[PDB]
């Protein structure tokens, strides 16, 4: 309500949960005038100023104003251990600097419980069938759910937003629609869940009479 | 060489790699006399004295002396982040206290590569067959390898000690011997590897036409 | 639900807000059997074990069980800066230790706004009158409200529990009932509010033609 | 004695004692030549370099030289908890960098005791009278004393510099001169003292039969 | 003035300046009654409670009272880097605990300058002669001065207490009296100075045509 | 193997062992193209970015490429206490940044033992003679050995590289060749060893009948 305004978004859950990826916190300044084109960002991790952020190139919004975005890459462990990320924004149209802070949801982590369901007898009169994955009992709400078969990703799924349950955990459901034939032919499908409360240092390779 | 002596052992790799378990560092004092029965342990984590250790009940060794053991439970993250554990031992037979320190091997972690092999044609003339799991390219050397089938553990395996390779990584091999019939009947077997460089926040549940 | 149980209470707001006082966190273990009389408390400040707690003398509850209380004195600045206090409780009736953690409410502090009101014309037909103190706009909810006149405390007041308002702040009201005569004779009454968002390093002494 | 020279000044006591204000440490470089116009400042808080300082625009001194000023805003709590502020100054006329450090006076804080005195009978034969405020027993010496009446500031006062007393505390006196009539008419005057050893989280609102 | 009282002494300068030695801070409680024999010491290093102190056995003073001494061994680097050592003392005769804190003198270290002088012509008419060692310009005042000849210590010296000079440094003088004959026969004597501002990682071994 | 490459060198042992000197860690980027002239260095001390490094002016190598050098001055105590220095290098020819880290050798410090030897009878038939200094038993390997006579440096010496001994310590030898006459005339020569395990706060001044 009145000035250029700032919003501060956390990383994608998938990015926080795969050590191979690069999670980032994103600081977005909107409603900046052509009069005052330039914006200065200062970034802090638990109050200590850090220097690795990258400002994306500013770009005119169709309502005359500019939108400027700074992204800060965060360390996998730092984010999940609860460090606080602050974005401070400075601008000629803005008599005092504005600051916003973000960090991971606080509270005891709770492990998702995962249940799958094959299509109904009803469901299988159609050319497509839907496979269901119910995921309950998790905290915090940040989660990523995907599907695979035969070591390859299956992307024709829809997943609901986590809904808070009666016990303070979250719940969601994912549905993957495939060709009935693919299901009929005995292909195995996998609902894959990534969540901070799953935590392991394990892989495996399997062998059979082939 | 001369006095009661102390040895300081790291936790089991399996215990460091499963967040559900309780890894401990163990401090063992041997060659203590009946004259001076009592031993005092002080324990330090990066130099800060901590109080959670538990001394097991002292017990006569068959060469007249006593053996006393203190165990300190370590935090999963602390161990893997390289904190240093010191055990200081004090004893009436010991004019000055002795101290020993341990911590995880230092150096860039490198991920194991895992390869399985079915039995040879030679191998299958016998009532038993052996399945092979080769694991290379890992650092540090701390690793745990096990086997399973049908969601249950297979414990009839032998695994070699990690051997340093020409590139500074480690290598080992595990062999699981089972009844040829069990292999013939198409049961799937899994070589499971736990190592710090595997690190994930992932589970899955699979479904097929059953 | 099943065992000896533990509750962990914060200090009194007055104690946290007067640097002269001694705020304490209190850890209470109930449902302990005569069988296992003794309880061990470990206390931690942001995870660092501390040693200054004092256990009050255990005392039989009228339902056969014992109730044991440990109190830890906390530093004025530590509490208000958000340090986390953990109480771990150990007991022969309790196969594993139980732990609870407490800390000050998190969120931006917001300053109380204070308004007083004299009695209504209605109100003053009676031998007593009531003075009203409305306090709004404060966060967190921890607050202490009292009254005084002529440099002496007035303790015949009733104060409501803070109620969350539509904007995420808290609100309450305090009423002090005094003899109508005392109000009539022009005595000045003061509603006094202590809250973390009031913060000053100020005193004054006043002088007039006396 | 020889070169451009640097002086490093603490914040104003009033600024350190009102959480609403912005205390700053000020680093002043004098005797800089037109030859070497530019000066680089590095600033450190307990040895950690910080980036928020602002250099005021350099300005010719009437003896040919330049005077350059950097100001660093300090956090209320940091200053009063004793953090050390260092200013390092670099300049083409200056073969090596110069550094200066400042921090709050060390020693146990001691609370001011405040006493007021009305004018003498002598004093009141004149058109003006003087009101006296004696403040003793305080440590450290940083203090701010002001006056008010009727919720408005009274600025016609003179206050002595703190003088070290026989017990290692400091003492001062403040005198406010007002029109005898204003004193005669029963206006209340307040001597207000701000000092780190006063520390409260208290406000009040007063009510009377009006 | 009134109660059992506590004094807290720093380590000996020699002990702080030789890494082979064991510097200790010593906390002494006097004026304790036979009524309340026992004293509890808590010790803190920069506010963190530590456990390595040793209480010497309490001992009756000839004025009916007891004197109890706790000594805490300090780390060479910790002391010289300015860590603060606190001793808190608790006693049945003492309604509240008393605490004292000590640390090394603060201020920029300044290196001693050392000058020797042979005996006067006057001086050498006597059977003994005195050798003089003047040491100036050092800060802080903690210093240890000794003498040697032929790789063996010379202990017949007297050294003055450091005296503050006009520039804020300290000064002292040491005199070693030996038999005139020993000086006559060409023996080399060495004034040895230990001070924190001397700091080296150097030794040497010398060789000549022997 | 493929790209511009980076090497990261520790300070000179002499520079780490004399508090008067300025030890630096040096980060060298080679194989940079004229196409992408500019290189960005980020430097970290135990993971905290620091700003005091200085980039030397880039300079063409005779194989068409450029060589760029950044030097970071390190604190005497920091280096010897084991802090880790990281150099991160960024360049248009280099699709991702490269990083290297260095720190002092880890392991218990062990003090050098120093032995000198005069020339053999054989050796002294020649116009020059050689003096030998054997230094053993030291850890880590960083060491500086030099020679002096009559308070002046003797620079005509050759010193071997430290060689690892059978017990995990290092050994070396230094030989100083001088004119036989200088040795004959009874001049004293000194082998001087600097090593972290020598550590003192000692100087001396000597006096004799002159
Ligand atoms: C002039 O025009 C401006 C431009 O807008 C136009 O742009 C055109 C191109 C076109 O798109 C037009 O349709 C559009 O109008 C306009 O700017 C807009 O201003 C709005 C009002 O100020 C902004 O509204 C806010 O939006 C927040 C959510 O934003 C996300 O979702 C919207 C769509 O729903 C999307 O448009 C945004 O781009 C944004 O998407 C997210 O983007 C981030 C950043 O990139 C992504 O995260 C990063 O991205 C990468 C991607 O690979 C990677 O994932 C990184 O790792 C990751 O970090 C996200 O993935 C992406 N998400 C999604 C879902 O898409 C709202 O949350 C916010 O609501 C809050 O504020 C309200 C009042 O200000 C308040 O009433 C409300 O309750 C809420 O308040 C918060 O609520 C919390 C809980 O309820 C509380 O706990 C908080 O305390 C509380 N906080 C506050 C401060 O109140 C808000 O409504 C709008 O985003 C912005 N448009 C854009 C494009 O940014 C401008 O206003 C116009 N001027 C006028 C009309 O005068
Ligand atoms: C056997 O008998 C036992 C003894 O009880 C008897 O004792 C007799 C003498 C007599 O009093 C009898 O009437 C009495 O029955 C019995 O023990 C009792 O067990 C109960 C169930 O387990 C306990 O219930 C809990 O009580 C909490 C509040 O306790 C305070 O208030 C009650 C009265 O309302 C009072 O009786 C208590 O003493 C306690 O008073 C506080 O005491 C503390 C500690 O001294 C004070 O703080 C300190 O004190 C000093 C004082 O100078 C100074 O101020 C210090 O600085 C300060 O630190 C407080 O000032 C004082 N407060 C008040 C108001 O008086 C409840 O909060 C708690 O509720 C939670 O748990 C429920 C389930 O376990 C759950 O359903 C509920 O939702 C809630 O859960 C929490 O909710 C939060 C928000 O909603 C969430 O965020 C949390 O996550 C969530 N947590 C959990 C774990 O769920 C609970 O009901 C009872 O206190 C206890 N009695 C006593 C005396 O301690 C035993 O059970 C019997 N066995 C049987 C029947 O088998
Ligand atoms: C060329 O000309 C230069 C310019 O000067 C001219 O400028 C004209 C415009 C006009 O003003 C002329 O009259 C003037 O000559 C000239 O520069 C001057 O050089 C002097 C010598 O080097 C400087 O002397 C030092 O002054 C210190 C005190 O300075 C304050 O007070 C004077 C007046 O008394 C004032 O003029 C200064 O501006 C300064 O005022 C303070 O300013 C600061 C910074 O802005 C304020 O603090 C900040 O300000 C804002 C304001 O809103 C806000 O409050 C912020 O939060 C806050 O941080 C202060 O409020 C303000 N205070 C006051 C009272 O006004 C002396 O302390 C210092 O003494 C020390 O050094 C001596 C030797 O160098 C030494 O002998 C002495 O003992 C003392 O030493 C210290 O003593 C301590 C205890 O006793 C020890 O513990 C210490 O260890 C010890 N330290 C040292 C290093 O020894 C010193 O005399 C002079 O300030 C400077 N002029 C200006 C304007 O800055 C230049 O020298 C000329 N060249 C020639 C002749 O060749
Ligand atoms: C009952 O009897 C009690 C026992 O005393 C008797 O014991 C007999 C056996 C016999 O000795 C009798 O003669 C004797 O009377 C009696 O206890 C005594 O109470 C006194 C008053 O309360 C104590 O006075 C204080 O003494 C301090 C100095 O003490 C040292 O020096 C004296 C001799 O000068 C010596 O007797 C002490 O033992 C002590 O010696 C030091 O001992 C320490 C500890 O072992 C050594 O350090 C350690 O030791 C080992 C050794 O190998 C190793 O070196 C460790 O590493 C090391 O840590 C020292 O080496 C050793 N030093 C020396 C020189 O020998 C005074 O400093 C102190 O003065 C302060 O307090 C006054 C008021 O309380 C105040 O007015 C004064 O100004 C000063 O105040 C301080 O001043 C500073 C600067 O000026 C300020 O910055 C401070 O802020 C300020 N502080 C305060 C609090 O004010 C004080 O006078 C006396 O020591 C004590 N006796 C003993 C033996 O301990 C008891 O009082 C009697 N009851 C009655 C009469 O009712
Ligand atoms: C194009 O041309 C480029 C320029 O080179 C030419 O320059 C001309 C002017 C002329 O000199 C020509 O002859 C020359 O060819 C060329 O660049 C070169 O590339 C090489 C290959 O990439 C580089 O090789 C590396 O050299 C390291 C040692 O370098 C020092 O020693 C050499 C001579 O032996 C010297 O030439 C260097 O300048 C360097 O000297 C050191 O310099 C530093 C920095 O200034 C000093 O330290 C600082 O200096 C100041 C001085 O006052 C002060 O002391 C500071 O405080 C201090 O910090 C040193 O004092 C000084 N030392 C000496 C002794 O002089 C090798 O260590 C390195 O080996 C490692 O890498 C190999 C593979 O990359 C690997 O196989 C090998 O095993 C080893 O690997 C390491 O081994 C460790 C233990 O065994 C392991 O623990 C490690 O994990 C492991 N690490 C890795 C990554 O494997 C390497 O061979 C060469 O230095 C470089 N030339 C220059 C001048 O920098 C370019 O390649 C050409 N392109 C082509 C042909 O396509
Ligand atoms: Zn920085
Ligand atoms: Zn892990
Ligand atoms: Zn402890
Ligand atoms: Zn992880
Ligand atoms: Zn304050
Ligand atoms: Zn406070
Ligand atoms: Zn050193
Ligand atoms: Zn030292």
Author numbering:
A (entry chain A), B (entry chain A), C (entry chain A), D (entry chain A), E (entry chain A), F (entry chain A): 235 to 444
Question: What did the study's authors say about this model?
Answer:
The homodimeric immunoglobulin fragment crystallizable, Fc, has been widely utilized to form fusion proteins with enzymes, growth factors, immune modulators, and target-binding moieties such as scFv. To search for an alternative approach aimed at simplifying product development, there has been extensive effort in engineering fusion protein platforms with a monomeric Fc modality consisted of only one set of CH2 and CH3 domains, either through weakening the interactions or by generating steric hindrances with the addition of glycans at the CH3-CH3 dimer interface in the Fc.
There has also been some evidence that avidity of the bivalent Fc has a large contribution to FcRn binding. We report here the development of a therapeutic platform for the expression of a monomeric Fc fusion protein that exhibits FcRn binding affinity comparable to the wildtype Fc. We devised a comprehensive protein engineering approach that involved using a unique IgG4 phage library design and thermal stability and folding selections, in addition to a pH-dependent FcRn binding selection, to identify a monomeric Fc with excellent monodispersity. Our results show that a library selection strategy combining thermal selection and rational template designs can lead to monomeric Fc fusion proteins which have the desired biophysical, structural and pharmacokinetics (PK) properties.
